[PDB]
Amino acid sequence: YTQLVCSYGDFNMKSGVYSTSYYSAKPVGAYYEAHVYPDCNFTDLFRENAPTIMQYKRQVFTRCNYNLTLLLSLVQVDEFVCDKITPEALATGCYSSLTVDWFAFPYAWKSYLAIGSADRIVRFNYNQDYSNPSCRIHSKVNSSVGISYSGLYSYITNCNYGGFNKDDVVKPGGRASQPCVTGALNSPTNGQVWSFNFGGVPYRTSRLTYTDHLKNPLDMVYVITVKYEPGAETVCPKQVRPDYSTNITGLLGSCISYDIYGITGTGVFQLCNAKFVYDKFDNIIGFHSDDGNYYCVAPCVSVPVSVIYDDNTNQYATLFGSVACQHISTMAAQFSRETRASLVNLLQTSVGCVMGFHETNDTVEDCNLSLGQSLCAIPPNTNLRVGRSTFGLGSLAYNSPLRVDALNSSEFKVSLPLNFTFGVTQEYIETSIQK
Amino acid sequence: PIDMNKADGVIYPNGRTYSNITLQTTNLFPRNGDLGTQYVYS
Amino acid sequence: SLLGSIAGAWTAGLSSFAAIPFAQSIFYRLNGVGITQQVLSENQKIIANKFNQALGAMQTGFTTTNEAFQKVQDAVNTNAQALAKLASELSNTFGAISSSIGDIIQRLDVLEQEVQIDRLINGRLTTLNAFVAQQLVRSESAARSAQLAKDKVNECVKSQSTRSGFCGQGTHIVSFVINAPNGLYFMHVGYHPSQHIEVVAAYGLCDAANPTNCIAPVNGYFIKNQTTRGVDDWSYTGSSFYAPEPITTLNTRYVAPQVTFQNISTNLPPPLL
Amino acid sequence: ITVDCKQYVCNGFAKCEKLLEQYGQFCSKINQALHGANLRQDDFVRNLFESVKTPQTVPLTTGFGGEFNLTLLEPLSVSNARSALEELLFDKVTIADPGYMQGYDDCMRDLICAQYVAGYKVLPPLMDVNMEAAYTSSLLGSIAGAWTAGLSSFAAIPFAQSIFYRLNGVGITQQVLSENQKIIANKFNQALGAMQTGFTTTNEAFQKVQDAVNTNAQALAKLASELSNTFGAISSSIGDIIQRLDVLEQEVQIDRLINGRLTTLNAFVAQQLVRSESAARSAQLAKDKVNECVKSQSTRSGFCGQGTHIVSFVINAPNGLYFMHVGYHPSQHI
Amino acid sequence: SSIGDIIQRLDVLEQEVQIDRLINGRLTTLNAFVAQQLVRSESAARSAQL
Ligand SMILES: *[C@@H]1O[C@H](CO)[C@@H](O[C@@H]2O[C@H](CO)[C@@H](O)[C@H](O)[C@H]2NC(C)=O)[C@H](O)[C@H]1NC(C)=O
Ligand SMILES: *[C@@H]1O[C@H](CO)[C@@H](O)[C@H](O)[C@H]1NC(C)=O
Ligand SMILES: *[C@@H]1O[C@H](CO)[C@@H](O)[C@H](O)[C@H]1NC(C)=O
Ligand SMILES: *[C@@H]1O[C@H](CO)[C@@H](O)[C@H](O)[C@H]1NC(C)=O
Ligand SMILES: *[C@@H]1O[C@H](CO)[C@@H](O)[C@H](O)[C@H]1NC(C)=O
Ligand SMILES: *[C@@H]1O[C@H](CO)[C@@H](O)[C@H](O)[C@H]1NC(C)=O
Ligand SMILES: *[C@@H]1O[C@H](CO)[C@@H](O)[C@H](O)[C@H]1NC(C)=O
Ligand SMILES: *[C@@H]1O[C@H](CO)[C@@H](O)[C@H](O)[C@H]1NC(C)=O
Ligand SMILES: *[C@@H]1O[C@H](CO)[C@@H](O)[C@H](O)[C@H]1NC(C)=O
């Protein structure tokens, strides 16, 4: 009754059969599942010589387990700029792949290396891609971590080519082309344009250094890009969620929270006959776990519960539409508190399972509590104040015609009135609406 | 020539498996009717 | 004015008006549906009493068991709900920090104010569009129902329908109309048999001695073995009330002979003698 | 259709359920709008079958039509409460099984199993198939006897006699009917019995039954499919938003996703209402035809079909009634 | 109102937000158009019958 009242927002509803929402289908317990692989070895990020921006390093991590705390515990974060991801989430999600780009770069120049800019820093050296969720981390790395910064650190300031002086601009996610790197590495550090041929094409390139801006705590840029391709996660965290189980069997037949290969939410799991199984509306309806078992997945709200209510007696009964009554006991945990207790009785009807009804051969003339398929609820004659009582499970009356049989004659029977009454058929026709 | 009615040269999506559906995709595909370059070894 | 035109609305054409008493109109309306004049004359007090019962019953009829009545209240409630939606949806905060423009302006800077106000505007435009679209859907509904009301005024009230179902259940006699909130309330008085008798009827009768001379009943039946109950006992009854009477030329028509017509010798009806 | 709005929109997520309060009592309004629309559909049925309902009938037996073959119209239980044509019509129209009884258990087709995922339910009709069939069966048995002024009496007249009087009443003399009575019965039987092979792609009335079915399916496809949409959000999944973004962007992203799901539900309710008005009009038409084409002989041109109207029959159809009007059509003139 | 103006003025992230705002409005217009044509089709069905 309370679910009915809250679903409609009305304490004084009329009699009828109403669908209702669930107000007690809360999760109890949780299940976590993820792939286990060798660690995503990140040594190359911290224990080598820092890359330049014109020749930055990239490493793509697949089929491994990562530890983001390990990357961050080694560095002093100056700033981070994340897009469609947060450092908090970056640390715990599963990805089809994880990509890290990195190079030495002055913190003072972080505005050059920025989303709306189109400076030479971006045009000829590093052009961040934004098609995938990513985060640009500006951090200071201490020499105690093994980071070094020998040699010249430089960026390309120009790289036009051909007779039209066409700027060989770097495309998002790309890098300076081999002709530009070849040129710039042979260019003077005073920013002067050097001309050379690369194969059959003339190039004019120039560079500037930033070596003088690099100090003992080394200003580094690490850009972490994560790809999400549901069903193809190969990269997962080493850390398992603190309150989640890693064995689902003790959680079957119950509404739980879950995190399965990056897919989260609540639902009810059942062991079924045979990594994610989808319907035609992109819903996950089952999965193959790593212990070999296949499970079905349903929302914690899967049974189309409706309430039959009589506002004269304030009596009510429940229909679990289209559900066989055997399955109702097992789903008791997701129903209202008083339904759950009552299930811990039921009649099977052609429209579903009904609770709070008794069988009756009585029929109904005006059926204001139709259940469907010629079934009608027949209200109790006792008010709720006395106590709860059941509804008759009856049917819509078929008031058959008089049967006048024909004669195998040249004559026929006719039924004529002997008496008669007058009756008034009342009808309302709405002819206009409020203006 | 590439025959689109046989899905010649079509690269399957790299995520989930799709079944008994039609999917609208913009991606790297061959052109229908395209004659590629033939190479011969002996 | 419509009530005052019912009794007089008689002949072909809509040009004339007859200032006929209501009671006379009812008796002709009953005769026109198969109740003979002898019956109407004998039962005229009974007819008036039953009619009065049926009609006067409406004084206590506007209750929760009266579907036509509840339908009036529902039309009223429907209009109220449409307005509830304009009045209530103003309080919504459509992704904004507040439903109040004033609260947005005094809390956020000039750039976020534009975003937040636009969110709030979009929701209020949506509400108005939804309102107009339903009024239009409800206008089409009214156009259809207004058309129906016109047909019933012209066919049930200003005349006597012979159409089944239309103008109510049973045999239609007379309709009345009063105004209702947002429309019209129709009250159709019909004739409803309460008890029946089954008798045997002929398709027609022929003179056995003169087989080309055959008759058929008009607005009734030729029924057998009801009066005197001897040889070749045939009599006429109105089709809407069992009341056997002698077969006369006022109850019959001459017809072509048929294989299903009875051939009678004795107590031959006057139309056949 | 009824919809569990709260489940449809938030899919069990508490943060969404809280944000949803900023749209007012949205779900309460949806629940009441759908409840109202569904009650109207039941009233259309109650009134339609008030017209189908007969005071008196002559019980159907085999050979009901006499010289006229009405076997395809009589109930199988005479020769199932449903006739051979009505079973044939229902078997040639492709309809997904709603699973009204234990349908939940079977899913543990896609627009039906989507009910228990998406958060919506297809409701059963007021009457079952037997009861509706009983009404049309009784209607068939009242045609021959439905003769004189007034609707008070009933004549248990053989079908064949009713046809001959119906033909006489439209200008065919008795000598003609007597000489050609075998010819009339044979032509009638040809025309009517032809329907056994009539439910094909060239039959517009039939294809119209399938289209009504397809229309209902499309409405549900829109509830089931639009949940997968990502309405400017990073994901269609609330869970993906919560686990990827911080607490402030989550509210913006969830609101984007909610707004789209509220829009879908509003669009659904508005069409059901437009389609309810359509049904109100068509239900009215069906009542007029039952009372004017079947229970009587129309003299109105066009109404009750082409040519001169003689007799109509009615069987049930998915979402409505199927009328078969037998008319008299001259084939050669002088 | 111009997609081209959005692309040439904003960066790649705000372009998606701004284009989505513009798309949502254009989808709304098309949905409103279809819904009225359907309401007007029902009107015509009734009048054609008349
Ligand atoms: C992820 O990496 C962190 C290091 O950043 C690990 O935490 C360290 O654990 C060792 C013991 O093995 C302690 O001595 C260190 O003091 C810890 N360091 C910090 C910063 O906490 C953490 O255990 C790793 N996670 C997993 C699942 O292996
Ligand atoms: C990690 O990579 C470094 C090279 O950068 C290599 O020397 C080291 O042995 C690797 N460690 C593991 C456990 O693979
Ligand atoms: C930085 O590295 C130096 C040299 O190894 C070490 O002495 C110092 O403790 C480190 N400081 C920090 C903050 O890690
Ligand atoms: C899960 O726990 C059950 C005991 O409750 C045990 O029998 C089963 O083997 C465990 N499964 C795994 C994968 O550990
Ligand atoms: C209804 O009638 C049937 C007839 O067989 C009987 O078996 C059944 O017990 C009756 N039920 C009730 C509730 O009267
Ligand atoms: C007709 O029915 C009424 C009500 O039962 C009764 O009072 C009256 O005497 C009856 N008359 C006949 C003709 O049976
Ligand atoms: C006429 O009615 C009487 C009285 O009921 C009955 O005994 C007699 O057999 C009937 N005769 C015929 C031909 O029906
Ligand atoms: C009455 O006589 C006519 C003419 O002989 C015949 O055609 C018809 O079948 C007879 N009908 C009956 C009821 O005997
Ligand atoms: C009557 O029609 C049925 C088909 O519905 C056919 O099987 C039967 O043979 C026909 N009978 C006659 C006498 O034509």
Author numbering:
A (entry chain A): 348 to 621, 626 to 695, 703 to 793
B (entry chain C): 51 to 92
C (entry chain A): 942 to 950, 952 to 1215
D (entry chain C): 794 to 872, 877 to 905, 913 to 950, 952 to 1139
E (entry chain B): 1041 to 1090
Q: What do the paper's sentences say?
A:
Although both spikes contain a furin-cleavage site at the S1–S2 junction, processing during synthesis was detected for MERS-CoV but not for PDF-2180 S pseudotyped virions. As the stem helix is strictly conserved between MERS-CoV, PDF-2180 and NeoCoV S, we assessed the ability of these two monoclonal antibodies to block PDF-2180 and NeoCoV S-mediated entry. Moreover, the strict architectural conservation of the fusion peptide region between PDF-2180 and MERS-CoV explains that recently described monoclonal antibodies targeting this motif neutralize PDF-2180 S pseudovirus as well.
Here, using a pseudotype virus entry assay, we found that NeoCoV and its close relative, PDF-2180, can efficiently bind to and use specific bat angiotensin-converting enzyme 2 (ACE2) orthologues and, less favourably, human ACE2 as entry receptors through their receptor-binding domains (RBDs) on the spike (S) proteins. We determined the cryo-electron microscopy (cryo-EM) structures of the PDF-2180 spike trimer as well as of the NeoCoV and PDF-2180 RBDs bound to Pipistrellus pipistrellus ACE2, revealing a binding mode that is distinct from that observed for SARS-CoV-2 and NL63. Our structural analysis indicates that NeoCoV and PDF-2180 bind to an apical side surface of ACE2, which is largely different from the surface engaged by other ACE2-using coronaviruses.
